[PDB]
Amino acid sequence: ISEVRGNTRDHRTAAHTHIKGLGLNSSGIAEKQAAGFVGQCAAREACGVVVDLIKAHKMAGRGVLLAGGPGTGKTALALAISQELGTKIPFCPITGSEIYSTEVKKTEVLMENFRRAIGLRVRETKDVYEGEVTEMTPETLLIGLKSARGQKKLRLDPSIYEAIQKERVQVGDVIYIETNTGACKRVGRSDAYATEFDLEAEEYVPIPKGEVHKKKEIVQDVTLHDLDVANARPIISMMGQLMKPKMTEITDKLRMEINKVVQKYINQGVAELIPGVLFIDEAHMLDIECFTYLNKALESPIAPIVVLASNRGIATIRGADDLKAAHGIPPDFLQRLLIIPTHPYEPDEIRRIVRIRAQTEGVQLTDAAVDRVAEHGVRISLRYCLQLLAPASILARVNGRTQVDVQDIAEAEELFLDARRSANILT
């Protein structure tokens, strides 16, 4: 579990790195401009209440729905819900279109995302005693350990004395003993007393490196999916390795081996598992079979916070014989969650956002350029205008400038056109 390192899809949250959380005071009322947020007071305060409902454990089989248009702070508020829940919490942003896979089933892909939303907080402090054995009999046992770069003799507690007698010991055996109720023995194992005659033996163990007394500090924050993806290999290259269509490395029997060891760490009290947040954009795209999986998922106490988002008003239920419902959510699951409405930003609110994103991205710009780009944030979507910051900075650097002006941003619209305008131009 120490070797297991967390691999996170940072490209999804890359557009929200400018947001630090949810800007609100002690009473609960949202601030005008805090934590990288502009406006959206009604929706900010609303989910600022749901974070408390999770903390108070009052979200008994409940979820959240973010109703609003494109670029209305939906995905942004979802990340704020995680950021406000605790430190190093799992946030899994998905889109209904991601479920629509070619090889894996509609929920074999929804399963790993649920595993990507449930984490594990580890806080294990162990006192290592590695090396050989040099027995002495006092009034309750003295053993001298020999390591690769050190030698130390220690007067063991009578608790260890009972544990060592159970697992046969002799002078010249490599051992791993722990003060925190730990007993492990390697009978006769020692590379020092190994002859070159026998090779197939493997009955000997090398002399442990460093010192005998070692203070092992384990502070690990990994999701359940990280445990599955690390135990699948028969690991640095794996962050860029996926070129295989089948993806048969993750099998149901491999997950059972993870579920049992995770349970063992909870029973010991070493590490407790912490459920996070599962965000589903394009919630209407989800099949009826997916919603019934979610209904079963929400009933489990281990389950994370299922936050959905739908840009549609009235939509046909996917997986049903054409049944129009609100946001495309079936009634069975619509009642299961509380709806939070996300309001569109007026031109005055849009330029306040631009200045925050430019400051984070590292793009210097004139006051007049912010006004021109905000005009595109109201005529077209908020995502399109925000995308104009990076090409205009290159166009300015090329012209020798650091400050981006109207002339530089005018070319950005000419070169990089939105999906709506690009279609109409072709006629």
Binding site: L53, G68, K106, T107, C290, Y293, S300, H327, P331
Partner: protein, 408 residues
């Protein structure tokens, strides 16, 4: 929470609020007639249909149908959507549902913990007039009696074989403390459903089942061992087969292949009471090209017995929200409940019930022991009902009506 049907024994005229049930006299009186129709043998192999507006205690009326049949008759809730699962055939999904409804009565020797409680994952101590003992609480046992709402001083009977805690009463505000030692093995009747016998005899579900692996699909080999043992027990006189009640919700969602199985399972002499529940006026049949009233095939509507629930009055809604307020341990001002019931008039009862838990947290941040009108008005303005949320999206999507008053 639900005590029974809440009806008169002789006249069969239902009380406005009795036996854990509130309102819906017309439906509850019709429910009482159906029970009597089966008992006399007048209705044989006929399904029930609770039609009506959403959140009109449709589950509660069917829960009342159960308790009014026998002392320990099995009752199971099944939503039609839950049948269409990614892993588990809709045949197995329906077989599990029917087996969850049919139970067996066997007299067994098992120890029952009887005595007064002195309350504190945790540790709850018990006491009798002769002996005193401390008991470490099991993770599943905590969740079992919190649903029962067991408080300190209550006299309870815990059957260790089933795990069910039964509230016998209280010593002080009454029933007196039991004499002898706590654990006593007696010949008690055990009623365990066919599906539960399958899940007991089959492979134990490992921790985090929804994390990965196949569903609760019971092997045909295991089910065979149970069926043959139950059949051997029927002949011996050891077991008594008791047909419970299956409650099917969202019935409009059922396929034509489901109704053919329901009638095939209903064909049996030991079939359960199949209660259907439709929240729709007019809905098309799935699998069939044709349309029908509640989404039932042309053949089912004539066989079924239809009962209709009605919309709750502000006075009927008044206590429902207050009962749910006490259950969720919240304290409201008379003005706040009046406002919460006023929400329940235009918007659903379920939406108004959601505003109860949300307003408590806003009142907790204000540091008040009374949840008021300004606390409820907040939840309504923060969290939107389905009809208002869709309205909000529709206007944001396309401005249907302009400032001039001109459309398009």
């Amino acid at each position: 929470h639900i005590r029974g049907l809440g009806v008169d024994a002789d006249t069969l005229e239902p009380r406005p609020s009795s036996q854990g049930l509130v309102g819906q006299e017309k439906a509850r009186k019709a429910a009482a007639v159906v029970l009597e129709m089966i008992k006399q043998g007048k209705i044989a192999g006929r399904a029930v249909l609770i039609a009506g507006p959403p959140s009109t205690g449709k589950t509660a009326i069917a829960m009342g149908m159960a308790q009014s049949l026998g002392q320990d008759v099995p009752f199971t809730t099944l939503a039609a959507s839950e049948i269409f699962s990614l892993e588990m055939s809709k045949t197995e999904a329906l077989t599990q549902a029917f087996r969850k409804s049919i139970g067996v009565r066997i007299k067994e020797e098992s120890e029952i913990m009887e005595g007064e409680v002195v309350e504190i994952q945790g540790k709850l101590t018990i006491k009798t007039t002769d002996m005193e003992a401390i008991y470490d609480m099991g993770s599943k046992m905590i969740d079992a009696m919190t649903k029962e709402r067991v408080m300190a001083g209550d006299i309870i009977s815990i059957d260790k074989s089933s795990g069910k805690i039964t509230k016998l009463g209280r010593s002080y505000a009454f029933l007196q403390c039991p004499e002898g030692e706590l654990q006593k093995r007696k010949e008690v009747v055990h009623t365990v459903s066919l599906h539960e016998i399958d899940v007991i005899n089959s492979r134990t579900q490992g921790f985090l089942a929804l994390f990965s692996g196949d569903t609760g699909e019971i092997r045909s080999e295991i089910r065979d061992q149970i069926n043959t043992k139950v059949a051997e027990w029927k002949e011996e006189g050891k077991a008594e087969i008791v047909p419970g009640v299956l409650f099917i919700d969202e019935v409009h969602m059922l396929d034509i292949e489901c109704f053919s199985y329901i009638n095939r399972a209903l064909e049996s002499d030991l079939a359960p009471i199949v209660i259907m529940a439709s929240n729709r006026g007019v809905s098309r049949i799935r699998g069939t090209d044709y349309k029908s009233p509640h989404g039932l095939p042309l053949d089912f509507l004539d066989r079924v017995v239809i009962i209709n629930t009605h919309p709750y009055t502000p006075d009927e809604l008044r206590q429902i929200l207050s009962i749910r307020a006490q259950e969720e341990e919240v304290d409201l001002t008379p003005d706040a409940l009046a406002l919460l019931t006023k929400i329940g008039q235009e918007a659903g009862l379920r939406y108004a019930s959601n505003l109860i838990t949300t307003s408590q947290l806003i009142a907790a941040k204000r540091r008040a022991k009374q949840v008021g009108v300004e606390d409820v008005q907040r939840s309504f303005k923060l969290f939107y009902d389905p009809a208002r949320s869709v309205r909000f999206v529709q206007e944001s999507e396309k401005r249907l009506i302009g400032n001039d008053g001109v459309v398009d």
